[PDB]
Tab-separated table of C-alpha atoms and ligand atoms in Angstrom:
chain	number	residue	atom	x	y	z
A	1	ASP	CA	0.000	0.000	0.000
A	2	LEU	CA	0.952	3.723	-0.086
A	3	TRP	CA	2.255	3.607	3.517
A	4	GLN	CA	4.696	0.849	2.466
A	5	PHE	CA	5.671	2.835	-0.587
A	6	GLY	CA	6.356	5.750	1.770
A	7	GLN	CA	8.588	3.655	3.994
A	8	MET	CA	10.550	2.377	0.924
A	9	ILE	CA	11.121	5.899	-0.288
A	10	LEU	CA	12.377	6.870	3.130
A	11	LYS	CA	14.679	3.837	3.407
A	12	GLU	CA	16.228	4.273	-0.024
A	13	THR	CA	16.543	8.075	-0.117
A	14	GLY	CA	16.950	8.917	3.552
A	15	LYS	CA	14.251	11.576	2.819
A	16	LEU	CA	10.538	11.466	3.803
A	17	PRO	CA	8.076	11.535	0.890
A	18	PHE	CA	6.682	14.894	1.996
A	19	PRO	CA	7.734	17.504	0.911
A	20	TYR	CA	10.761	16.069	-0.884
A	21	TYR	CA	8.922	13.757	-3.293
A	22	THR	CA	5.171	14.629	-3.109
A	23	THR	CA	5.747	18.302	-4.168
A	24	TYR	CA	8.588	17.744	-6.674
A	25	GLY	CA	8.362	19.167	-10.148
A	26	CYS	CA	5.603	18.745	-12.709
A	27	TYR	CA	4.559	15.159	-12.383
A	28	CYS	CA	5.251	14.004	-8.749
A	29	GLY	CA	3.981	17.301	-7.272
A	30	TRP	CA	1.258	18.242	-9.725
A	31	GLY	CA	-0.664	14.967	-9.524
A	32	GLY	CA	0.466	13.682	-12.931
A	33	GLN	CA	-0.616	16.629	-15.079
A	34	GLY	CA	2.689	17.950	-16.374
A	35	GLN	CA	5.606	16.517	-18.360
A	36	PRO	CA	8.338	15.250	-16.029
A	37	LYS	CA	10.949	18.053	-15.690
A	38	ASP	CA	13.867	15.819	-14.775
A	39	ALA	CA	14.781	12.207	-13.796
A	40	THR	CA	13.516	12.239	-10.172
A	41	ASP	CA	10.315	13.624	-11.695
A	42	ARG	CA	10.012	10.839	-14.276
A	43	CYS	CA	10.452	8.206	-11.516
A	44	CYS	CA	6.940	9.077	-10.391
A	45	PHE	CA	5.650	8.830	-13.986
A	46	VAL	CA	7.168	5.337	-14.299
A	47	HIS	CA	5.668	4.394	-10.992
A	48	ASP	CA	2.289	5.593	-12.226
A	49	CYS	CA	2.836	3.476	-15.345
A	50	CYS	CA	3.796	0.346	-13.333
A	51	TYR	CA	0.564	0.802	-11.264
A	52	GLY	CA	-1.482	1.204	-14.514
A	53	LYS	CA	-0.365	-2.229	-15.768
A	54	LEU	CA	-1.957	-3.813	-12.722
A	55	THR	CA	-5.543	-3.676	-13.915
A	56	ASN	CA	-6.535	-6.552	-11.626
A	57	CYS	CA	-4.895	-5.084	-8.473
A	58	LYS	CA	-5.455	-2.438	-5.816
A	59	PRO	CA	-1.953	-1.085	-5.556
A	60	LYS	CA	-2.803	1.779	-3.190
A	61	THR	CA	-4.447	-0.292	-0.519
A	62	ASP	CA	-3.101	-3.801	-0.891
A	63	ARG	CA	-0.487	-4.557	1.728
A	64	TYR	CA	2.425	-6.722	0.626
A	65	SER	CA	5.437	-8.343	2.456
A	66	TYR	CA	8.986	-7.008	2.080
A	67	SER	CA	12.243	-7.166	4.070
A	68	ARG	CA	15.000	-4.434	4.179
A	69	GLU	CA	17.052	-6.152	6.841
A	70	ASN	CA	20.450	-5.999	5.019
A	71	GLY	CA	20.305	-2.634	3.186
A	72	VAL	CA	18.418	-4.073	0.217
A	73	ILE	CA	14.641	-4.157	-0.356
A	74	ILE	CA	13.664	-7.785	-0.773
A	75	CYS	CA	10.080	-8.353	-1.948
A	76	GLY	CA	8.609	-11.319	-0.111
A	77	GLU	CA	5.738	-13.811	-0.394
A	78	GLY	CA	2.153	-12.821	-1.001
A	79	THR	CA	-0.319	-12.892	-3.853
A	80	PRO	CA	0.802	-12.193	-7.437
A	81	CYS	CA	-0.779	-8.725	-7.143
A	82	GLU	CA	1.068	-8.042	-3.844
A	83	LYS	CA	4.414	-9.080	-5.355
A	84	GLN	CA	3.875	-6.930	-8.429
A	85	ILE	CA	2.811	-3.911	-6.384
A	86	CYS	CA	5.927	-4.355	-4.152
A	87	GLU	CA	8.137	-4.418	-7.302
A	88	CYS	CA	6.534	-1.205	-8.589
A	89	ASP	CA	7.201	0.444	-5.236
A	90	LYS	CA	10.771	-0.890	-4.902
A	91	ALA	CA	11.634	0.263	-8.374
A	92	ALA	CA	10.440	3.791	-7.743
A	93	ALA	CA	12.212	4.175	-4.415
A	94	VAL	CA	15.457	2.859	-6.122
A	95	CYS	CA	14.957	5.391	-8.983
A	96	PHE	CA	14.653	8.255	-6.555
A	97	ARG	CA	17.922	7.138	-4.817
A	98	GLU	CA	19.836	6.578	-8.100
A	99	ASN	CA	18.844	10.135	-9.060
A	100	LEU	CA	19.717	12.044	-5.834
A	101	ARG	CA	22.740	13.490	-7.715
A	102	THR	CA	20.496	15.530	-10.052
A	103	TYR	CA	17.882	16.323	-7.294
A	104	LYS	CA	17.116	20.094	-7.320
A	105	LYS	CA	15.613	21.785	-4.244
A	106	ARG	CA	14.049	24.371	-6.618
A	107	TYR	CA	11.653	21.895	-8.138
A	108	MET	CA	9.972	21.453	-4.741
A	109	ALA	CA	6.593	23.186	-4.872
A	110	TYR	CA	7.389	24.153	-8.435
A	111	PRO	CA	4.816	26.592	-9.772
A	112	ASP	CA	2.374	24.537	-11.930
A	113	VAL	CA	2.003	27.468	-14.363
A	114	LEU	CA	5.382	26.659	-15.907
A	115	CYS	CA	4.517	22.943	-16.341
A	116	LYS	CA	3.985	21.673	-19.919
A	117	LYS	CA	1.342	19.057	-20.891
A	118	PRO	CA	2.336	15.310	-20.807
A	119	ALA	CA	4.343	13.927	-23.703
A	120	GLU	CA	5.984	10.583	-22.799
A	121	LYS	CA	3.744	7.476	-22.690
A	122	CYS	CA	4.076	4.326	-20.533
B	1	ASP	CA	9.082	25.792	5.322
B	2	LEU	CA	7.233	22.659	4.083
B	3	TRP	CA	9.639	20.337	5.959
B	4	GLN	CA	8.692	22.114	9.218
B	5	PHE	CA	5.038	21.888	8.314
B	6	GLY	CA	5.600	18.154	7.798
B	7	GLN	CA	7.183	17.743	11.210
B	8	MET	CA	4.262	19.651	12.862
B	9	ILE	CA	1.735	17.413	11.185
B	10	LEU	CA	3.615	14.382	12.401
B	11	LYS	CA	3.916	15.705	15.970
B	12	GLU	CA	0.261	16.653	16.289
B	13	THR	CA	-1.338	13.694	14.485
B	14	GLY	CA	1.174	10.935	15.128
B	15	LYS	CA	0.813	10.286	11.341
B	16	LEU	CA	3.316	11.191	8.569
B	17	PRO	CA	2.010	13.598	5.914
B	18	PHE	CA	2.315	10.954	3.200
B	19	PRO	CA	0.009	9.167	2.432
B	20	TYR	CA	-2.289	10.123	5.305
B	21	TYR	CA	-2.596	13.846	4.543
B	22	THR	CA	-1.087	14.447	1.047
B	23	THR	CA	-3.546	12.010	-0.675
B	24	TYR	CA	-6.661	12.749	1.426
B	25	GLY	CA	-9.917	13.613	-0.245
B	26	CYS	CA	-10.626	16.313	-2.806
B	27	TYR	CA	-8.589	19.247	-1.666
B	28	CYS	CA	-5.506	17.923	0.275
B	29	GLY	CA	-4.931	15.081	-2.227
B	30	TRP	CA	-6.062	16.673	-5.468
B	31	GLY	CA	-3.849	19.757	-5.239
B	32	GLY	CA	-6.672	22.154	-4.333
B	33	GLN	CA	-9.016	21.457	-7.246
B	34	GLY	CA	-12.031	19.945	-5.523
B	35	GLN	CA	-14.437	21.043	-2.781
B	36	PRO	CA	-13.290	19.762	0.618
B	37	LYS	CA	-15.199	16.497	1.317
B	38	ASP	CA	-14.941	16.645	5.092
B	39	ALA	CA	-13.236	18.537	7.983
B	40	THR	CA	-9.720	17.026	7.684
B	41	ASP	CA	-10.039	17.953	4.007
B	42	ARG	CA	-11.001	21.570	4.719
B	43	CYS	CA	-7.984	21.931	7.066
B	44	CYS	CA	-5.812	21.941	3.961
B	45	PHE	CA	-8.086	24.529	2.293
B	46	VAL	CA	-7.750	26.804	5.344
B	47	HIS	CA	-4.033	26.291	5.312
B	48	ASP	CA	-3.969	27.269	1.648
B	49	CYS	CA	-5.993	30.356	2.585
B	50	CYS	CA	-3.639	31.310	5.469
B	51	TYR	CA	-0.671	31.026	3.012
B	52	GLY	CA	-2.560	33.210	0.447
B	53	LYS	CA	-2.835	36.090	2.944
B	54	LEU	CA	0.942	36.238	3.126
B	55	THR	CA	1.518	38.079	-0.127
B	56	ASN	CA	4.878	39.399	1.083
B	57	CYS	CA	6.190	35.991	2.290
B	58	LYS	CA	7.650	32.755	0.963
B	59	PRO	CA	5.806	30.312	3.154
B	60	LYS	CA	7.079	27.170	1.412
B	61	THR	CA	10.750	27.910	1.735
B	62	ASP	CA	11.120	30.291	4.643
B	63	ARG	CA	12.369	28.509	7.730
B	64	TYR	CA	10.954	29.690	11.045
B	65	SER	CA	11.695	28.846	14.758
B	66	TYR	CA	9.317	26.742	16.865
B	67	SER	CA	9.547	24.610	20.025
B	68	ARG	CA	7.411	21.469	20.834
B	69	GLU	CA	9.295	20.601	23.988
B	70	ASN	CA	6.232	20.228	26.305
B	71	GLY	CA	3.575	18.704	23.999
B	72	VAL	CA	2.514	22.080	22.612
B	73	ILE	CA	3.763	23.825	19.450
B	74	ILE	CA	5.177	27.166	20.514
B	75	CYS	CA	6.024	29.532	17.644
B	76	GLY	CA	9.261	31.338	18.417
B	77	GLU	CA	11.218	34.430	17.349
B	78	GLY	CA	11.963	35.306	13.760
B	79	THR	CA	10.761	37.790	11.185
B	80	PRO	CA	7.076	38.776	10.981
B	81	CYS	CA	6.762	36.553	7.887
B	82	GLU	CA	8.386	33.590	9.716
B	83	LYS	CA	6.033	33.975	12.695
B	84	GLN	CA	2.980	34.185	10.460
B	85	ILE	CA	4.029	31.176	8.394
B	86	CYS	CA	4.623	29.182	11.644
B	87	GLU	CA	1.084	30.119	12.830
B	88	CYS	CA	-0.420	28.947	9.526
B	89	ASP	CA	1.424	25.648	9.882
B	90	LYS	CA	0.587	25.186	13.587
B	91	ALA	CA	-3.056	25.860	12.952
B	92	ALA	CA	-3.290	23.270	10.212
B	93	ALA	CA	-1.499	20.545	12.146
B	94	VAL	CA	-3.866	21.285	15.151
B	95	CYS	CA	-6.902	21.076	12.788
B	96	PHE	CA	-5.823	17.702	11.506
B	97	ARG	CA	-5.455	16.430	15.139
B	98	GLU	CA	-8.790	17.925	16.322
B	99	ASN	CA	-10.426	16.093	13.401
B	100	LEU	CA	-8.872	12.590	13.760
B	101	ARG	CA	-12.286	11.400	15.064
B	102	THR	CA	-13.936	11.919	11.648
B	103	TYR	CA	-10.802	10.784	9.658
B	104	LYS	CA	-11.852	8.206	7.002
B	105	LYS	CA	-9.281	5.813	5.503
B	106	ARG	CA	-11.463	5.688	2.342
B	107	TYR	CA	-10.736	9.261	1.398
B	108	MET	CA	-7.046	8.384	0.967
B	109	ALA	CA	-6.275	8.363	-2.754
B	110	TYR	CA	-9.894	9.252	-3.362
B	111	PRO	CA	-10.725	9.048	-7.054
B	112	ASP	CA	-10.652	12.660	-8.395
B	113	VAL	CA	-13.541	11.871	-10.777
B	114	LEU	CA	-16.018	12.087	-7.902
B	115	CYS	CA	-14.635	15.463	-6.703
B	116	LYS	CA	-16.861	18.545	-7.199
B	117	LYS	CA	-15.524	22.018	-8.157
B	118	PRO	CA	-14.537	24.464	-5.315
B	119	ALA	CA	-17.299	26.343	-3.533
B	120	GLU	CA	-16.077	27.806	-0.208
B	121	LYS	CA	-13.858	30.927	-0.347
B	122	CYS	CA	-11.097	32.046	2.064
C	1	LIG	CA1	16.459	14.294	-10.607
C	2	LIG	CA1	15.901	11.910	-5.984
C	3	LIG	CA1	-12.138	14.625	8.897
C	4	LIG	CA1	-7.242	14.159	10.681
């Protein structure tokens, strides 16, 4: 579920989702309505894509099993939906971490007015 | 700033902003575009209002001083903007807490499609 996604983001990035991810840029922080401005910003678009492929799942509310004991997110047992949701969430939290180097504090609470309409597709 | 707002929300509600507040309902979780669905949901609308009154401030990025030593948020010294931002943030975190009793888990990630256009005004 979203609370597990939150915890993954924290564990991978050492940052809490709010305000660092939830308000970032034109896609994370504008609810999906603008073209991703940078890589961090696209991570959310990819995550939205990975959720869209799960037509038979409830990725926001289904609770999966994962372990992070040894520094690595390990997706555990559960239903096929739960596993697939977990993998969407892991992959996004990893993407945020891999892209800390280009993370810009300026894109936080970025004014929506400057956001362009969506262009990439899943 | 938003990170301080985040910490106030956590301290008052015992919940992290994401996903409990950032995705709630039609105003908190839909970036301000729908009519608040309930009281928790209006708290965000009031907070948006309190920020709007601060035409001469940067409420998202200005860092104020507050203390929560004794269970109560005490807004400290700083510029008049910093004080006023702090009071906006305190008042919203208190509103969320006062309204935990009517908090509905269903409004988390509420489908935007069912959201009505804004009606109340600041
Ligand atoms: Ca980036
Ligand atoms: Ca990042
Ligand atoms: Ca409520
Ligand atoms: Ca509440």
